[PDB]
Structure 1
Amino acid sequence: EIEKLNNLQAVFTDLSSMDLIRPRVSLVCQIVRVGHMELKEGKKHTCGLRRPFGVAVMDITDIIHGKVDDEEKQHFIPFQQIAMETYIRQRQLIMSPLITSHVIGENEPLTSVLNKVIAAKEVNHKGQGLWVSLKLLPGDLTQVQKNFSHLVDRSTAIARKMGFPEIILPGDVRNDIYVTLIHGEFDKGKKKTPKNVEVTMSVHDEEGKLLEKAIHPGAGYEGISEYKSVVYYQVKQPCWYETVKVSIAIEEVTRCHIRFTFRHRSSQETRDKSERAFGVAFVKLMNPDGTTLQDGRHDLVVYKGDNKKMEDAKFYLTLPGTKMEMEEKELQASKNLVTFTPSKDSTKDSFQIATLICSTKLTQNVDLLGLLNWRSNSQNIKHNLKKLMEVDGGEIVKFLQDTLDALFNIMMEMSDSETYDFLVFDALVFIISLIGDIKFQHFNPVLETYIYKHFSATLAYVKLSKVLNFYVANADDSSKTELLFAALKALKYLFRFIIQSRVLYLRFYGQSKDGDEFNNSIRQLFLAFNMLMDRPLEEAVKIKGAALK
């Protein structure tokens, strides 16, 4: 890219406070050669094949620390090539040749050379490297492009962090799905020469049509229809560890899946293009529970058989894709012997991928979704509520609005179950406690936005007052101590919601008929607090402290 030659300016965004104070950060530049399979002259070879060449690494933690910052410094990061050690030491072996092995100078995965460079602080570059001026610019992409616009114009490349910052801004709309090709064990089949498996991933829809540009190889480069993995030479289980970026329409990702067509890229072009994907794995970006694909490792399974069945969405999508999917179908078949016939096409071949979904809207939780489906999952609402608190606030904050509305709906529809009242009470206590945390304190404006604009209850406040009055009435309960104490920790917003429900009652029924009863509840709550405090201090020293707080 001649246009990039003077515009090869990289900026990594989202680099949070804990990122800078990380003990070790290294600037790893992976150099992958693209072209022919074998570095030989004489035979025509396929173009566009990626092969491992080398990786340049420099520990830029102190640069990220900001200890030394200077544009003039053109850091020459030494380049480490893979050990192609088969041409120098062979010329001197006399009087005792007894050796049986093969030639392996490229077959090492890039993670191997990466770990070598990480361990060995010295790199024998032999005059090969790259010049860069590394400086840390405070702030995210915006103020970097505004307080350092000269260095970082809009034409400067944009790169984001593997993770999330300490301050999740409300409306951090993103769809950064980072797919890492950890490894894949693909059998050599009837070829003694190990297959040069290339993961030409293909985002097909539920109808099987390939999605274009949904796969982005990395920052500073646009999306592509299909991403081809590095074609490892005669490696039975290639280990790529190649991260690609997937940014599909966040509302289309439910109908979108990735089809992993594994093609053996032989030493010759006619063989390569005459060889189809002997095996194909895949994953669908939604879980069966209506949630998007969970963040972490997914153990794909490479199928075998009719390639027509491999490429037709109505079959391979319906067929299980991951090893967990093998287990799911097998276990559902164990109880029900109704037309569940396992296929001998299920070879031992399998694939491994990791999905770092950096997104805001995408849902990954079971009990939270069941609570979303409360109107049809009242049976699990007991368990959905019993397990919602272990759901991290990162998931809750995604649709806190619908969560709050659903809790209030549970309250109005079937308020008879005081058990669900208690569950919703404690879950809401935890909700407000986590929103008050520094992580989610900036959603508190959005929380109050919901309260003033989207709160949807008229008498739940009555039951909240009743339950909280019970909480203060049973303050001496050790099991209540943590529950009542955490309620105390956020009583301001609990009562903001209660006031919202009361005022909705007011403006929906005109006059406060139970205004006197309401105030009586308030007063009896005060005197219950009095009963709490006049109890011996030893039981609840810290609890009366938080009460005063």
Structure 2
Amino acid sequence: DQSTFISENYLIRWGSNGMPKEIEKLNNLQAVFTDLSSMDLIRPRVSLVCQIVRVGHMELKEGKKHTCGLRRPFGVAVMDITDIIHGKVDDEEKQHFIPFQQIAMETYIRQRQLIMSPLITSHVIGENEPLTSVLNKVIAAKEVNHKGQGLWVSLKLLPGDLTQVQKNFSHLVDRSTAIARKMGFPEIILPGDVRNDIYVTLIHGEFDKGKKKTPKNVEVTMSVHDEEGKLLEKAIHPGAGYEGISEYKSVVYYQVKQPCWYETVKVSIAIEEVTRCHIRFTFRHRSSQETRDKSERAFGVAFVKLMNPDGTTLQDGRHDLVVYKGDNKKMEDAKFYLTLPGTKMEMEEKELQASKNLVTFTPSKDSTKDSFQIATLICS
């Protein structure tokens, strides 16, 4: 109904051999989504959502090496969990199954029967679709043509906050269970609910191809930097139950002109350290060839100042980060690009300021049409 995340995305690393990448987790893949206010119950439709992201090569072709460490959209599995959080279905034994929808690669089956009138000019789109579209589909498509694919989960709503979760259901929810905080605030704000759960939802970003015909496989390797641009470690977390990563590499899309990620991920900086830190967003064209990938530099980099110049932290809602083309060494230096603005509102302010004072103020031609969008909801 709301089409926004209630809690942070609990990340599960799943391996390529049928077992989880974290082999110790398959028996302990427990995540409890907390801060669920009483209004979190009354939501007319609540759906449990798993974002399936294949990490690895760009293309499944044998014969030549391909780039590793690249994330591509695979699918999303959604089931109506509205009743369970409404206190209607609550039982340990019920391992509710969430049918899984993969992006439609169906371009091989019916291709063998088309005769006597071939006039068609088209191509293959089975990997370009962002995971948001599959999410919306499975939200609409209660039943999924999952063909025996999905995630098996036992779902229980537990009364109370973390404490009541732990003191009556320590068996179900031990301390090793992953904890996810609601994207927002609970109805009871304990005085001193000290948090710095800054969340950067990598909404989308458009990136110009230039002379190259193939659309750019842009990977938003968002990074958190302070005023001198040093990489803040542990700042960005992909979500719940996962160790924060200094640079959150986004989903590398299969030649998509306007890739959309909407990757609601955690950024937990010290509340005093965020006062001197920002988040820089580096974009690299991840071509299908590994040598070309490692030889392709960051064609554009965006950033965002977590501190507003008015002594306030980054505002809630959405802000359109500006991708900057030009000298890479100039864009890798904070004392240059931080002085440059990061969002559309910021360069608009700078341009209007420079308009009244025409003293060595030529508008930077580097303000390219390439942009990046983030959704900010600082729960602090």
Quickly name the TM-score band, shorter chain normalised.
Answer: over 0.9
Superimposed CA distance per residue, residues 437-477 of structure 1 (whole angstroms, 9 cap, x where no aligned partner): xxxxxxxxxxxxxxxxxxxxxxxxxxxxxxxxxxxxxxxxx
Superimposed CA distance per residue, residues 265-317 of structure 1 (whole angstroms, 9 cap, x where no aligned partner): 00111111111111111101001111100011011111111000010010000
Distance 1:254 1:309 in 2: 24
Superimposed CA distance per residue, residues 479-538 of structure 1 (whole angstroms, 9 cap, x where no aligned partner): xxxxxxxxxxxxxxxxxxxxxxxxxxxxxxxxxxxxxxxxxxxxxxxxxxxxxxxxxxxx
The alpha carbon displacement at 1:101 in A equals: 1.1
Long gaps (5+) in structure 1: 359-548
The alpha carbon displacement at 1:129 in A equals: 1.2
Superimposed CA distance per residue, residues 357-401 of structure 1 (whole angstroms, 9 cap, x where no aligned partner): 00xxxxxxxxxxxxxxxxxxxxxxxxxxxxxxxxxxxxxxxxxxx
Distance 1:190 1:93 in 2: 36
Regions of 4+ moved over 4 Å: none
Distance 1:127 1:106 in 2: 21
The alpha carbon displacement at 1:228 in A equals: 0.2
The alpha carbon displacement at 1:97 in A equals: 1.0
The alpha carbon displacement at 1:325 in A equals: 1.2
Long gaps (5+) in structure 2: 1-21
Distance 1:63 1:351 in 2: 37
Decide which structure has greater strand share. Answer: 2
Q: Tell me which of 48, 53, 77 is aligned to 1:32.
A: 53
The alpha carbon displacement at 1:243 in A equals: 1.0
Moved more, 338-347 or 49-58: 338-347
The DSSP-based 3-state class of the residue aligned with 1:261 is strand
The DSSP-based 3-state class of the residue aligned with 2:32 is coil
Superimposed CA distance per residue, residues 84-117 of structure 1 (whole angstroms, 9 cap, x where no aligned partner): 0111111111111111111001111111111111
The alpha carbon displacement at 1:5 in A equals: 1.2
Distance 1:252 1:43 in 2: 45
The DSSP-based 3-state class of the residue aligned with 1:114 is helix
Distance 2:187 2:149 in 1: 39
The alpha carbon displacement at 1:235 in A equals: 0.3
Distance 1:285 1:316 in 2: 14
The DSSP-based 3-state class of the residue aligned with 2:331 is helix
- Please name the residue that 1:14 is paired with: 35
Aligned length: 359
Distance 1:42 1:220 in 2: 37
- Please name the residue that 1:66 is paired with: 87
Superimposed CA distance per residue, residues 317-363 of structure 1 (whole angstroms, 9 cap, x where no aligned partner): 001111111100111112111221112222111111111100xxxxx
The DSSP-based 3-state class of the residue aligned with 1:11 is strand
Verify the 8 A CA contact 2:78 2:142 in the aligned structure 1.
Answer: no
Q: Tell me which of 215, 223, 229 is aligned to 2:244.
A: 223
The DSSP-based 3-state class of the residue aligned with 2:76 is strand
Residue 177 (structure 1) aligned with residue 169 (structure 2): no
The DSSP-based 3-state class of the residue aligned with 2:55 is strand
TM normalised by structure 1 equals: 0.65
Distance 1:236 1:130 in 2: 31
Superimposed CA distance per residue, residues 415-449 of structure 1 (whole angstroms, 9 cap, x where no aligned partner): xxxxxxxxxxxxxxxxxxxxxxxxxxxxxxxxxxx
Distance 1:217 1:249 in 2: 17
Residue 80 (structure 1) aligned with residue 101 (structure 2): yes
Distance 2:174 2:148 in 1: 32
Q: Tell me which of 341, 344, 355 is aligned to 1:323.
A: 344
The alpha carbon displacement at 1:173 in A equals: 0.4
- Please name the residue that 2:125 is paired with: 104
Verify the 8 A CA contact 2:236 2:246 in the aligned structure 1.
Answer: yes
- Please name the residue that 2:264 is paired with: 243
The alpha carbon displacement at 1:65 in A equals: 0.7
The DSSP-based 3-state class of the residue aligned with 2:319 is strand
Distance 1:70 1:320 in 2: 52
Distance 2:303 2:63 in 1: 37
Verify the 8 A CA contact 2:224 2:247 in the aligned structure 1.
Answer: yes
Higher gyration radius (CA): 1
TM normalised by structure 2 equals: 0.93
The alpha carbon displacement at 1:19 in A equals: 0.3
Decide which structure has greater helix share. Answer: 1
CA RMSD of aligned residues (A): 2.1
